[PDB]
């Protein structure tokens, strides 16, 4: 007898539901929704109680944690699933894991966990394996089955982002390793407890494979608390309303979700084809990236083109033909994490007032060619900072959707896109309590947001992976890091220029304090801004590094000399560097590094990115430019060149607008634009000559060569666009950089007894 | 009710036995051995059946394996334990794990595995955790409890050396990582099966955390087979002879072992104090050691002094006060692996014809100060190539014991010591079967042995960790590595010079063939020979690297040009290098590297070390020098300078002795030695001046500074010996190299619910 209510096995149950979905186009073959249509009062009561239950689990259980990432920032999520692993309802927070935890349940279904090791009432499962769909090892899942009268009726999943998982690099978004081997403690749907009790062998092992043991332990108790709170609530709801009504809701709620997406697409968008692209930099050639494998030492660029099709029937399709290959770094991903993040974006714009569950995934088609960075075909890839690529590809999809909104008149919904979510301040060694430790600041939960068609973006406000941004309290971060704040400031000229300006980021200056045997490193975008502005707007600023060693600050503090405080207001004209005549200063574009020794009184700049702009900056309201200068959002010297606005300082020290001189400056910039530009055909003629001569850096050529091999339709498009002869070719081997993994790869499904679950066309 | 036969818990049972051992000086308080004394025929029958059973398990189960390390070389072991985790009998092979697997059982005892996760009939445990005593992660243990009528009566352990465990570096003895984080998949006494059946979550997880998956899987079936063969045999023996007799044997056999050691010490040795020391090099400053942490980039030297005391009552004591600190590399150890290796040495010299079990450990006292490399006090240390330090410290103990043998007249037992067991040929990528792979050659199972007081050492014959040496067949290694042999040759002038010559090593030249996306690296002693000669003999030769890239060998082979074959006969006067005019050749002292790209037709020299010599070379039989030159054991040019023997080539091409010219050369060398030497006081005066001026390299100064801090008795000895003033000091911080971990450390016993087992004074 199978364990699901009614007697099917888990696999029999899911296979029946997936076949009916495929045959009918409706989730589970549900052509009507009987509970919703015939018993609307009961449908709403179950919705209300269960949604309040999952929200309450997150709000309450987070008070268990010692880590501020969980306890203050709220980087956790609890989700309720039906027997087939499809989500019905969720808390807010890090909701990408609605998809990752469901995909882990489906892996158990498909690989016969029911027969061995068994799925029993009061069991506890733990999982973080990115090969079966997770974002990265630091997002740990606890999964508990739910039983009613001896049969399985659902599951509950809880996730927390933990500080570290014992990777080569000390942090969550770690560098140093270039493969799975060294990428952190990785757990594949392990049974870690039974009879509601954790096994001691699991406890002893797990706790010694991480740096931040005590923080790890309390994050685990946080996840188990919320899972058991939700299990208890489901048992009470079933006792009170009856299993038949709950059993109907558990599948109807998903189809209701799909219906909600379809309706919102037809109400808000326009049918058609939308084309867009994103990129980001991987500067691994630099000497301060000390990786232990020579085949990883090269500069590469991520490529993510998307063809987006909205159909007349309210279905839609996203095709990533042309994308670049996985690589020897920690930025690779998986079909589940990639597509779950697109679902997260949908929750922030298309479906925020519909059912928030897996229904909307069933209403979207995805094509991710096998072997690309978003659907890799090699079981050795590393994932610790998956986000570097993920957040840089998702931002372009906001631009496509915004063209539909703009065309139709829903200007309030337009958003030029998400910021790159970085820098991530990281490091390890001994802390102020004389214990082994690591740090990973979540200040980059609070980056700038994209401008709209109606108003400026928000500064220091959000991240694509959690719109409820929070930078945390300085006094709380000081309890969890051997560092002290010397500044926290809004980041001038970081927001993307436009008629409406993208949100600025912010910055903090840290001094090392009460640390021993300590190291730190940087992780974020450097040479490339991943976001683009929309309809005339510009990208946000890109990244850079500031650090200072052997500062002599102990003596400078004691003698009453000037000391660096605040932010690095104008990095082209800095004030701090001249105050530290004896220091070794690193001030450059190298926004990715591996761990380097730091001591007490050394300095580290944490810089959070801005978001992209909207519209021609020459149309910005002149008073808004003056307000931005007075408020620290824009440096005075760009008012003239970027916006054509002339400002002058009044008697009170405040800048005001010269309206006559501004009109003249803007008339003159219109003429300058015509004088400096050329017809696009003429510029194309010169660029085509460079392509024929192979005149670009190795990082540009490697990106095109790898993209061409994985995406023949893209190669054909490029050749046609640039009118290239068949005698021109770009083999990756002729560039002169290492190309390990370009031809030979071994997928996880090649190992014995492994059955992978397919979610996309590939 | 406790699970041990009679109703004691595991912990109650062991604690009672250890208290009686301490109170009486006899294992388990056994003042007489009733079964042995009153029923000698039955005692011998149990011995015979059970020893044959464990020998048969090793011989038979190894035929399961795909890895030649297990199947041909026999790098596996099976051991039978009593309920308290003390060994009764063992197969031969890698018998250091008699101690490591017993210490893992004792960890389970001491940490209440009985209450959670429980210890049940037909359970399967797996373990490799070096923090609780194991050599390194590549030695995997399977441990099965043995029950009789529902109560526990013993355990069986089986170990195999596996090819890799998914460390940063591709190999068993890996470099690249500098901490536990990246040192390989580490398993802490995990329950991996029940009802004789392995759990699917364990199978899926374990198999994706290693490169050599198929080899891993068959090594696991090998261990479970032998464990279950032995469990069945114990059940049959108990059924036939009765539980009462078996229960007596299970403790008497251990005390019989202790009695055997005591008697052998009093029959073979001399009471007194013996003083000796060993060293080895860690050249991590070199650019070809690409580690990901800057605090690890420095040159250091391992220091292992030993004060050995043999008492009038036949007890003995080994004290390692003065030893150097753990470091940021893969060469650290643990009190269990260090002391178990001394027990292995004992089995090869003192007790080979006594009971081979834990009894001899109870008859030996060890002192390893906490924080030294052999008893570290930090839970972050790495262990993948523990042996580098271990084999370099154990060799000196042969010299001490040999002075007792020599003095008493047991010249047949003298041995100048064990070779350094290296090089380890390692690497990874795609193999000839187009799968992900790693290699780790066990050619260094067959190194030279130390000379005796009666005869030469054996060439290419053994290792300290397994005296049954085997180099493997070339045709078998070619099935498991994408490499082909171009040479296999005895290594001339590697054996340590003496009246009796130490065994030579051997060498093999490899060409890369049918590999893709391939890397390789070197691991062994370079600047320092760890072994010393005895009573006038010399150390074996030290290590070096030869590798060649971009060789052009495809064209050289095809054109009929000379190609490198055989061994690198005289590395001072090489022949291969001139044959490869277009190659990039690396020929130097850097015997430790991290992974480097290699391609088909590139070359790698695998060089196995020799063993130390005995006596003044001027007393060697002249014909034996001529035989050595003719046989390829010694290069011609050293006959005159080292041995004072004059040889000449006859008409037949063979070297022969000039007996008259040899007598004259030896008389003249005696005079040369007197003329070139100085009185030891005079030499001491000049060396003391250098010490006072701090004139030595950073690696020498760091070794003394670290040793002084951990060993105040050693600092006092050094100051007294060299008559140094109190104004002279050597703080580690003044050297100018990184010193992370010199003051701050956190032991595994500081984590919650961890109870460590103590085996030594510290
Ligand atoms: Mg492939
Ligand atoms: Mg498969
Ligand atoms: Mg003289
Ligand atoms: Mg403790
Ligand atoms: Mn996370
Ligand atoms: Mn081993």
From Swiss-Prot, chains A, B:
Zn(2+). The heterohexamer contains tightly bound iron, manganese and zinc ions. Transmembrane segments: none annotated. This is Acetone carboxylase alpha subunit. Belongs to the oxoprolinase family. Its EC number is 6.4.1.6. Keywords: ATP-binding, Ligase, Nucleotide-binding. One of its GO terms (molecular function) is ATP binding. It comes from the Bacteria. Its cofactor is Fe cation; Mg(2+); Zn(2+). It catalyses: acetone + hydrogencarbonate + 2 ATP + 3 H2O = acetoacetate + 2 AMP + 4 phosphate + 4 H(+). Disulfide bonds: none annotated. Catalyzes the carboxylation of acetone to form acetoacetate. Has a reduced activity on butanone, and no activity on 2-pentatone, 3-pentatone, 2-hexanone, chloroacetone, pyruvate, phosphoenolpyruvate, acetaldehyde, propionaldehyde and propylene oxide. Signal peptide: none annotated. One of its GO terms (biological process) is cellular detoxification of acetone. The N-terminus is blocked. Optimum pH is 7.6.
